[PDB]
A paper describes a structure:
Piezo ion channels, Piezo1 and Piezo2, are mechanosensitive channels (MS channels) that underlie force-detection in eukaryotic cells. The number of cellular processes found mediated by Piezo channels is large and growing at a rapid rate. Their essential biophysical characteristics include responsiveness in gating to mechanical force (i.e. mechanosensitivity) and selectivity of the pore for cations. Viewed down its 3-fold axis, the trimeric Piezo channel is a triskelion with extended arms; from the side, it is curved as shown.
Using cryo-electron microscopy (cryo-EM) we determined a structure of mPiezo1 to an overall resolution of 3.7 Å. The refined structural model contains 1518 residues (out of 2547), with the N-terminal 576 residues and internal flexible loops missing. The structure’s extended arms consist of 24 helices arranged as six repeated 4-TM structural units. The six 4-TM repeats assemble with each other also as a left-handed helix, causing the extended arms of the triskelion to spiral away from the trimer’s center, out of plane with respect to the central pore axis. At the center TM37-38 form a 3-fold symmetric channel lined by TM38, capped on the extracellular side by a CED, and extended on the intracellular side by a pore extension (PE) helix. The cuff consists of ‘elbow’ helices (residues 2116 to 2142), a ‘base’ helix (residues 2149 to 2175) and ‘hairpin' helices (residues 2501 to 2534) from all three subunits. The transmembrane pore, lined by TM38 and the PE helix, is closed. However, the detergent micelle containing a trimer is curved into a dome shape. A negatively charged patch of amino acids (E2257, E2258 and D2264) on the CED lies in close contact with a positively charged patch (R1761, R1762 and R1269) located in the extracellular loops of 4-TM units 2 and 3.
Author numbering:
A (entry chain C): 2164 to 2355
B (entry chain C): 2452 to 2456, 2463 to 2546
C (entry chain E): 1155 to 1365, 1493 to 1578, 1655 to 1807, 1952 to 1997, 2015 to 2065, 2075 to 2163
D (entry chain E): 2500 to 2546
E (entry chain E): 2212 to 2259
The structure:
């Protein structure tokens, strides 16, 4: 390597004096500078592998509703679906921003949502579903209301089918919402 | 909304920028140590010696290989003989 | 002297506050009266009591009519909802027609109705009108006093000393430029010597070629009192050396103001005879401040004045040193608040001043002119008035429901231009007005208010930029410190669609650092002009028109420090000896640890060595350049 | 190491004054000082 | 970074039961749920 460098110094001798280099400075020095800044610059890639497709909305498909009187059958399975599941207009955002004036947290935490995040689900109150019976379920609901003093629990459960094609893994989100029924209460007497 | 997929990985950014940092500092900061073996004038005699060793490796006269190799080792054990043996003339 | 000399401009501050914090037409009259008196105060204090008191009585009569017209419009407290929803050019929010008395329509409880609603938080506003009324009558007592008869007699002598104050500026500037002239000539004589030493050695080589409680009561006495008091006294010593350049000429003009008052006591002047015995009988003290005093041509009360202000005690002597620093270096203070309110208000109309700061206040080579400071004063007055307007809910962009729509959104064009209806709408513009007028008062105290149309201004502007022999300083170490602190703040800004903007900040920061070593090593003043012009314009566009965030404000503060230093190297030139590394000068202990700590940073020594090779003009290759600087780093 | 700082600072001011023949000849002094450690012993005594 | 939150119990919510006679409908869908889903006492461990 040294011998070849010395022979190119012989075959192409630069003038033995005050020879400033013309553009080979910009040829290889600027190459080194740009390459080395690029080594500082790959956090472009380190931040392009973070938070890319964030923004696809979880508009649900189905919403169901039950009402279980104790350990017996539900009174409803109202799977409210499309097109009765309706998204918002911007005037619906105006309605929420006007109906929730005297709370600051209401205004802030509704304004956190996009014009597509918040969807209605117009649930029909008229089920087309025969409430299934049996003379054990018949009589023991009557016994838990008339004779039974133990607290009957009424749940109110949900469902949400979400697009797995829109990303995300959790399809269904549910919560039970239990109210108990006291003995000699007005609710048990009216149901009896 | 959907996020379909920090603090423990920016430290691995600082890890890889330090590794490449001292990797480029390999090319710098220690070449004054190598001036006495690479910044030398006319190198004709040592190519004569190395090509002597190669053809002696062909002709299997290996005593000449060991004696020429003792010339190489002693040329690289004494930089003032490197100055003698690599003048320009 | 605090009351009878400095508590007159405080009155104009209270006039500006009563205009600002309660908004009406009469508050606009308070603002215009404040602006007129801030302009003409230096000649109002020099009038006589048959005319200044007439103008002052017009001001007192204005405040009384403000109070009485608010009673005349408290007539409309009863008839209120009749004039409300009927458009009488919406006359309620003109005069802020709202009541304060309890036995009425109960304001800020009928705020719940909102369609064409009023403003309750700006009340009847008689509080600040009565506070101003207190200050106006107190000043009338002051203008009718003999104490003001001493103060105005003291001010007229400064009105005479304007010419000699400019003469003392001329003396110190000629002495400083000749001092740099001696430094440059001695340095080039050293380079001539050393080049002859190198040539003489190598021509010899040509010829050779030719051939107990006290154990901790000691701590809670010494480390409590004495060591802390020594550090506080060291800070006073540092500020005294920081403003001795102003303190000495102020003391010289103080002694001559004493003698000029004793000449003004019965006559106007007599051939400047008070200047004859002043500098001659005390010339050693008048040698550091005055130089050309005797070329053109003892006081005991000031002696005991100094002797009884030398024993003020700490935290008042420190305050005196601090106020002398503020009064001396006030160009930078005006620049500081012009930057500071633009850091807070991110508007497009608050861009107008710091662009002109970085391009026309910093780039005028001796000093900023009359024209800039008058432009800054007039534009801040216009900005106060135009932000005082559009605090009215007249026009539908000022209404409250669309304000809830455009809350915290940098797309609304009054929010982009700076017309927000917030309560603190004057962020720092009050501080900016007092800073600009105080600096005008200092420059008025001294002698400082002296294809075809763009050419005789700008060609002469660059003719100022490229022909004066001014100074020789090197500020590149401080510029590069500010650039590293920019990088530190940006990497702290990734600790937060916003982080994709800090990336383009990093590319432009690396590009500016590269072009900085290019222009520094090639000494090109013209290129550094164009580079600072394109940076001021492009950064002030790209930050505020496109992108508030505290780390973005803090990056802007360090970057505008960097613009101040780059313009300070536009003036004061480049020295004719760049001299390599800045840490290889003193050979100290801490200097060694800073050098090794510099090399511990990954990619600085590489870039320093490569770019110094590219932009200097040597014969070596790249590897030879690396060999030299590795030898030099090991040997240092 | 006083003499070699004299030589390196000579190279730096010669890089300023553009008398680059002196740069090449002083750089030949550096290379030969780092090619011969017995001259390093000569040139870095204490005295 | 290994075996941190190991230990959270899989106590179920619902248990259903069917009985399909051939390719025809089930006779039961008894979704036995809470509170009829009851965990153990330590005496139940003693019983086992």
């Amino acid at each position: 390597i040294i011998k070849c460098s010395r022979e190119t110094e012989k075959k192409y001798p630069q003038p033995k004096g005050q020879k400033k280099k013309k553009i080979v400075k910009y040829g290889m020095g600027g190459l080194i500078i740009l390459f080395l800044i690029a080594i500082i610059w790959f956090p472009l890639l380190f931040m392009s592998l973070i938070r890319s497709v964030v923004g696809v909305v979880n508009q649900p498909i189905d919403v169901t509703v039950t009402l279980k009187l104790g350990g017996y059958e539900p009174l409803f399975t109202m799977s409210a679906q499309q097109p009765s599941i309706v998204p918002f207009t911007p005037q619906a955002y105006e309605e929420l921003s006007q109906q929730f004036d005297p709370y600051p947290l209401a205004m802030q935490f509704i304004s956190q949502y996009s014009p597509e995040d918040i969807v209605t689900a117009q649930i029909e109150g008229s089920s087309g579903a025969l409430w299934r019976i049996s003379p054990p379920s018949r009589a023991q609901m009557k016994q838990e209301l008339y004779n039974g003093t133990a607290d009957i629990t009424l749940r109110f459960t949900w469902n949400f089918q979400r697009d797995l094609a829109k990303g995300g893994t959790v399809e269904y989100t549910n919560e039970k919402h239990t109210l108990e029924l006291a003995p000699n209460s007005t609710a048990r007497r009216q149901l009896a | 909304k959907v996020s379909p997929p920090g603090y423990g990985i920016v430290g691995l950014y600082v890890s890889i920028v330090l590794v490449v940092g001292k990797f480029v500092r390999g090319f710098f900061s220690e070449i004054s140590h190598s001036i006495m073996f690479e910044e030398l004038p006319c190198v004709d005699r040592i190519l004569k010696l190395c090509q002597d060793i190669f053809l002696v490796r062909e002709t299997r006269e290996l005593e000449l290989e060991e004696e020429l190799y003792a010339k190489l080792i002693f040329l690289y054990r004494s930089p003032e003989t490197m100055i003698k043996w690599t003048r320009e003339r | 002297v605090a009351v009878f000399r400095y508590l007159f401009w405080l009155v104009l501050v209270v006039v500006f506050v009563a205009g600002a914090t309660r908004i009406s037409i009469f508050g606009l009259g308070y603002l215009l009266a404040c602006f007129y008196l801030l302009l003409f105060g230096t000649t109002l204090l020099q009038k006589d009591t048959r005319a200044q008191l007439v103008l002052w009585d017009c001001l007192i009569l204005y405040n009384v009519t403000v109070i009485i017209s608010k009673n005349m419009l408290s007539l409309l407290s009863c008839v209120f909802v009749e004039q409300m929803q009927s458009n009488f050019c919406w006359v309620i929010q003109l005069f802020s027609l709202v009541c304060t008395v309890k036995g009425y329509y109960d304001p800020k409880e009928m705020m719940t109705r909102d369609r064409d609603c009023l403003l309750p938080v700006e009340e009847a506003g008689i509080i600040w009108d009565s506070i101003c009324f207190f200050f106006l009558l107190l000043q009338r007592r002051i203008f009718l006093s003999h104490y003001f008869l001493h103060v105005s007699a003291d001010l007229k002598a400064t009105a005479l000393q304007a010419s000699r104050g400019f003469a003392l500026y001329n003396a110190a500037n000629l002495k400083s430029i000749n001092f740099h002239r001696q430094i440059e000539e001695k340095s080039l004589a050293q380079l001539k010597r050393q080049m002859k030493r190198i040539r003489a050695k190598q021509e010899k080589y040509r010829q050779s070629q030719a051939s107990h409680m006290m154990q901790r009561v000691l701590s809670t006495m010494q480390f409590l009192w004495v060591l802390g008091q020594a550090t506080v006294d060291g800070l006073t010593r540092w500020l005294r050396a920081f403003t001795k350049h102003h303190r000495t000429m102020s003391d010289v003009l103080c002694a001559e103001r004493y003698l000029l008052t004793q000449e003004l006591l019965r006559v106007g002047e007599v051939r400047r005879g008070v200047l004859d015995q002043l500098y001659v009988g005390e010339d050693e003290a008048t040698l550091s401040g005055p130089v050309e005093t005797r070329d053109g041509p003892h006081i005991p009360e000031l002696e005991e004045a100094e002797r009884f202000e030398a024993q003020q005690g700490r935290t008042l002597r420190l305050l005196r040193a601090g106020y002398q620093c503020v009064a001396a270096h006030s160009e930078l203070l005006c620049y500081f608040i012009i930057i500071l309110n633009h850091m807070v208000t991110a508007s497009a109309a608050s861009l107008v001043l710091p662009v002109l700061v970085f391009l026309w206040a910093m780039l005028t080579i001796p000093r900023p002119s009359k024209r800039f400071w008058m432009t800054a004063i007039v534009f801040t007055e216009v900005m106060v008035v135009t932000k005082y307007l559009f605090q009215f809910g007249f026009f539908p962009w000022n209404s409250y429901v669309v304000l809830r729509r455009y809350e915290n959104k940098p797309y609304f064009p009054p929010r982009i231009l700076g017309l927000e209806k917030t309560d603190s709408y004057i962020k720092y513009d009050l501080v900016q007005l007092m800073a600009l007028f105080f600096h005008r008062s200092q420059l008025l105290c001294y002698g400082l208010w002296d294809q075809s149309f763009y050419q005789p201004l700008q060609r002469f502007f660059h003719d100022i930029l490229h022909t004066k022999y001014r100074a020789a300083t090197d500020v590149y170490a401080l510029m590069f410190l500010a650039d590293i602190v920019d990088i530190i703040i940006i990497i702290f800004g990734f600790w937060a669609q916003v982080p994709q903007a800090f990336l383009f900040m990093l590319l432009v920061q690396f590009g500016t650092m590269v072009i900085d070593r290019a222009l520094y090593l090639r000494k090109t003043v013209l290129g550094k002009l164009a580079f600072q012009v394109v940076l001021v314009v492009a950064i002030h566009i790209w930050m505020f028109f496109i992108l508030q965030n505290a780390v973005a404000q803090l990056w802007y503060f360090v970057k505008c420090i960097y613009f101040a230093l780059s313009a300070y190297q536009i003036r004061c030139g480049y020295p004719t000896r760049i001299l390599g590394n800045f840490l290889t000068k003193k050979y100290n202990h801490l200097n060694l640890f800073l050098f090794q700590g510099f090399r511990l940073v990954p990619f600085l020594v590489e870039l320093r060595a490569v770019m110094d090779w590219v932009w200097t003009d040597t014969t070596l290759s790249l590897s030879n350049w690396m060999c030299v600087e590795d030898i030099y780093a090991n040997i240092f």
